[PDB]
Design a protein. Structure first.
Length: 139
């Protein structure tokens, strides 16, 4: 398989991509990441600069996707992945939420049947060059 820009991903598939973490939120059910590679996708939620919480330190418009982490992915990332980290996510599942918005999911996979993974990427890896250069456009 190959990597995709978040502008290129569609629902009901598996995909891999690099992104930067904007927001994290943990509960006793799952761990949530909001991530962006600063490319636009028509299925992403349009974040309003006029009503979004001042806590939102990410882009506005359809530039961020919500990732739901379950089971081992939750337990592993919930006290590890932080806001601002760069991540690489491999073979995650994409779906449509109830309101038509695209999101991605990391289901528990004890069988290791899908070879999913999420990991931090050092800021200096050239794989992140494109993200950093695109982030310059939106600041």
């Amino acid at each position: 398989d190959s990597f995709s820009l978040l502008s290129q991903i569609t629902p009901h598939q598996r995909c891999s991509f690099y992104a930067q973490v904007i927001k994290t939120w943990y509960s006793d059910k799952n761990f949530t990441l909001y991530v962006t590679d600063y490319t636009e996708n028509e299925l992403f939620f349009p974040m309003s600069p006029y009503t979004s919480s001042s806590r939102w330190r990410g882009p506005f418009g359809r530039f961020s996707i919500r990732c739901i982490l379950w089971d081992e992915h939750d337990f592993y990332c919930r006290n590890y992945i932080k806001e601002g980290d760069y991540v690489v996510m491999k073979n995650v599942r994409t779906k449509i939420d109830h309101l038509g918005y695209l999101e991605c999911i990391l289901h528990g996979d004890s069988a290791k049947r899908y070879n999913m993974s999420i990991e931090k990427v050092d800021s200096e890896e050239p794989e992140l060059n494109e993200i950093k250069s695109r982030k310059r456009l939106y600041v």
